[PDB]
Design a protein around this ligand. Structure first.
Ligand SMILES: *[C@@H]1O[C@H](CO)[C@@H](O[C@@H]2O[C@H](CO)[C@@H](O)[C@H](O)[C@H]2NC(C)=O)[C@H](O)[C@H]1NC(C)=O
Ligand SMILES: *[C@@H]1O[C@H](CO)[C@@H](O)[C@H](O)[C@H]1NC(C)=O
Ligand SMILES: *[C@@H]1O[C@H](CO)[C@@H](O)[C@H](O)[C@H]1NC(C)=O
Ligand SMILES: *[C@@H]1O[C@H](CO)[C@@H](O)[C@H](O)[C@H]1NC(C)=O
Ligand SMILES: *[C@@H]1O[C@H](CO)[C@@H](O)[C@H](O)[C@H]1NC(C)=O
Ligand SMILES: *[C@@H]1O[C@H](CO)[C@@H](O)[C@H](O)[C@H]1NC(C)=O
Ligand SMILES: *[C@@H]1O[C@H](CO)[C@@H](O)[C@H](O)[C@H]1NC(C)=O
Ligand SMILES: *[C@@H]1O[C@H](CO)[C@@H](O)[C@H](O)[C@H]1NC(C)=O
Ligand SMILES: *[C@@H]1O[C@H](CO)[C@@H](O)[C@H](O)[C@H]1NC(C)=O
Lengths: 102, 92, 85, 258, 102, 102
């Protein structure tokens, strides 16, 4: 099941990465947002929070972009599965080595 | 007494022309289908609260509704807005 | 003119009805026509359909399912816990 | 063509005690910000939303002159992101203030002592007691009295009323031109138009928040602002290993411009 | 026409979003670039303009990335279409449920 | 092995009128900037693209010493990005100036 387990592992790894990026300063004095807001008034805190926004947002764009490209790969796999479903479940396929060796 | 405002009290939020467009804004608006405190002049006109500001529909055939007063305490220990609309003019 | 307002009162001549309502901070969608005139509006907070109209920036909403918001259970009260020295 | 009252504001007999600072609205006039900025009088002329140099090119619906005396050590407080009890109870510039702060020594004017100089959210005023005063004497250097004016500038969509000493040209139409309307700087093809502004409206816009139309501030006709003619330049070439002759496609523009 | 009309809608929505993003101030004092330039001398203006550049460029990189992923979808659909042209117009498709049910 | 002519700069008998400030080129010599930086003679030593510590490790195709007198209130003006009548008419620094003001 290495294929499916890798799709699951990739999604879980990407989510664990996305979550772990909340531990990252990106140059702000903490990565836990309530630290900045409990320590700092808005004129200062806007500077620090812009870095957390920027870093978290850049991480989120990164995650979503990996997911869009992965979604295209899954969609190609879905279209391939749909085609084996059509040609080989709902049919028999003459395409050599399309529906298993033989 | 009471009635329903329906879709009323919408105004131009800014002095910018826009056309054929579904623009979006946030402002102090009379909420849609909110409750309307329909006063009468029968045989009185109390001081109201202003809250976040007012809408004031006032159907007429007499032209006796002719002014407004606004402010904090309306009692000379404050400056207080007065409006008059005497025959032709608006006077403030 | 800068003045602070908490109260108001109409003037009538001693010789009628007036239909006071109250404003609120509300998000809205506005239909400007070809003559740059507002012909229609949506108060976004009114109901889940009106939140959908604002979420799509559209007056028609089609047959479907639209995430208008995230619901969050609100903090009931504030709790304070310091060492009792 | 009216001159603005800055000659009053910067010479007014008493600047207020900072607990209850003066505010003069300025409107319906022409302002020589250059003469103010070039004036030998001012110990500081710090500006925030605009450079004091740029001011004459740009104009405003209104300007508010907040006038008061401070101790000369206090000048720190009269900025976005600055703090103190005076700058809490009885003063505050917002932390995104659009304007200028102009201040100078007034020991020659406001010292006597002068115990009238009582001190205590953005542009808030307030009237146990949180109250204090100076007592300014001619013997007081940052412990002396200083006058300050804050000019806070208004950029609403209404027609401008306070402007720099900029001089209008005639209008030009159907031609790609540089323009400035009341401080709206840009470049485009000004043309008179059928977009019917309602009588209160002073600009017109589209999706980008671009000024797709204006109303001229002297003759109240409505102008479209269509873009100056633009497009990619593409060079059609055979191989250099065949000829050095080329042809140029100017994308979408009309040969009449080229 | 839901497929083609949604492709038109998607592209127009991507352009309209990219266009709206010109009005988003990205933490600069204003989003009208000529307003910044007519307010400010370069010692100040360059920070404000650089925030707008960083925002607009990030928005443009976003739009182009969305368009590259969408162009990959469209190209996969174009290769699919070209294959239905080659197999079903210029030919007959033996492949069950490739060219219509039945 | 020539020691640089900093005495002819910092110990010049008179410095120039700032409308017409003097410029001295320095070339072909050994410069211990620590002899300057460790001198208590200087009320400020601020540097704008280099740290006065680092100077001994780094070296230059030329150095230009610009030398003049000012009123003590003016010292603010003599930096990149500044404003004031001298900074307008007669001592504008580059807004990316690499060097030190003493
Ligand atoms: C307008 O002026 C009134 C006073 O006439 C202010 O009223 C006070 O409001 C605060 C809360 O904001 C209360 O704690 C006080 O008890 C009120 N005092 C009185 C005498 O009513 C009011 O704050 C002002 N409003 C604004 C928006 O400036
Ligand atoms: C709202 O107004 C309606 C009539 O428009 C009335 O029946 C209802 O009791 C009112 N409720 C409140 C809370 O004012
Ligand atoms: C209205 O009132 C003002 C004074 O409040 C007065 O000058 C004016 O003549 C009055 N009449 C009309 C018709 O405006
Ligand atoms: C626009 O306004 C004109 C009068 O200015 C009117 O005749 C026309 O019917 C209006 N059109 C729309 C769509 O409101
Ligand atoms: C103050 O008044 C004098 C004349 O008394 C005038 O020359 C000066 O220009 C005024 N100040 C300003 C800033 O205009
Ligand atoms: C401006 O002046 C011209 C004459 O020079 C006049 O025709 C026009 O009505 C005036 N416009 C305004 C807005 O006062
Ligand atoms: C390029 O030019 C050389 C001579 O300059 C010629 O021999 C060759 O065939 C040419 N090749 C192509 C691809 O045009
Ligand atoms: C080019 O400009 C002329 C007017 O100068 C116009 O008649 C013609 O229609 C234009 N052609 C195109 C392709 O826009
Ligand atoms: C300047 O002269 C003083 C003694 O008059 C000396 O201490 C100092 O080192 C000299 N500086 C330079 C750069 O030669």
């Amino acid at each position: 099941l290495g294929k499916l387990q890798d799709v699951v592992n990739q999604n879980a790894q990407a989510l664990n990465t996305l979550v772990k990026q909340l531990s990252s300063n990106f140059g702000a004095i903490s990565s836990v947002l309530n630290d900045i807001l409990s320590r700092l008034d808005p004129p200062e805190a806007e500077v620090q929070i812009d870095r957390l926004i920027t870093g978290r947002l850049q991480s989120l764009q990164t995650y979503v972009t990996q997911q869009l490209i992965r979604a295209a790969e899954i969609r190609a796999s879905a279209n391939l599965a749909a085609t084996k479903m059509s040609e080989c479940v709902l049919g028999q396929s003459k395409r050599v080595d399309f529906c298993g060796k033989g | 007494a009471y009635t329903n405002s329906f879709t009323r009290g919408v105004y131009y939020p800014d002095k910018v022309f826009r056309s054929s467009v579904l623009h979006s804004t946030q402002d102090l608006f009379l909420p849609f289908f909110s409750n309307v405190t329909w006063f009468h002049a029968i045989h009185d006109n109390p001081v109201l609260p202003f809250n976040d500001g007012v809408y004031f529909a006032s159907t007429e055939k007499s032209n006796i509704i002719r002014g407004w007063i606004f402010g904090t305490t309306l009692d000379s220990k404050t400056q207080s807005l007065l409006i008059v609309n005497n025959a032709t003019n608006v006077v403030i | 003119i800068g003045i602070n307002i908490t109260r108001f009162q109409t003037l009538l001549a001693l010789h009628a009805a007036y239909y006071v309502g109250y404003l609120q901070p509300r998000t809205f969608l506005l239909k400007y026509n070809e003559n740059g005139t507002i012909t229609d509006a949506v108060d976004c907070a009114l109901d889940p359909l009106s939140e959908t109209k604002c979420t799509l920036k559209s007056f028609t909403v089609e047959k479907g399912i639209y995430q208008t918001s995230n619901f969050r259970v609100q903090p009931t009260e504030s709790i304070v816990r310091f060492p009792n020295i | 063509t009216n001159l603005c009252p800055f000659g009053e504001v910067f010479n007014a007999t008493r600047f207020a005690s900072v607990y209850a600072w003066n505010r003069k609205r300025i409107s319906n006039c022409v302002a020589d910000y250059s003469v103010l900025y070039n004036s030998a009088s001012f110990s500081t002329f710090k500006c925030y939303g605009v450079s004091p140099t740029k001011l004459n090119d740009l104009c405003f619906t209104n300007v508010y002159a907040d006038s008061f005396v401070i101790r000369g050590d206090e000048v720190r407080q009269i900025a976005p992101g600055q703090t103190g009890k005076i700058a809490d109870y009885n003063y505050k510039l917002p932390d995104d203030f659009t304007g200028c702060v102009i201040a100078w020594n007034s020991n020659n004017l406001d010292s006597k002592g002068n115990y009238n100089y009582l001190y205590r959210k953005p542009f808030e005023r307030d009237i146990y007691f949180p109250l204090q005063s100076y007592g300014f004497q001619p013997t007081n250097v940052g412990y002396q009295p200083y006058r300050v004016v804050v000019l806070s500038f208004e950029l609403l969509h209404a027609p401008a009323t306070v402007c720099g000493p900029k001089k209008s040209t005639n209008l030009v139409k159907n031609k790609c031109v540089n323009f400035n309307f009341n401080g709206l700087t840009g470049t485009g093809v000004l043309t008179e138009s059928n977009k019917k502004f309602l009588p209160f409206q002073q600009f017109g816009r589209d999706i980008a928040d671009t000024t797709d139309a204006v109303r001229d501030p002297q003759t109240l006709e409505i102008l479209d602002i269509t873009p100056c003619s633009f497009g990619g330049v593409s060079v059609i070439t055979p191989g250099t290993n065949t000829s050095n002759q080329v042809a140029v496609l100017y994308q979408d523009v009309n040969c009449t411009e080229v």
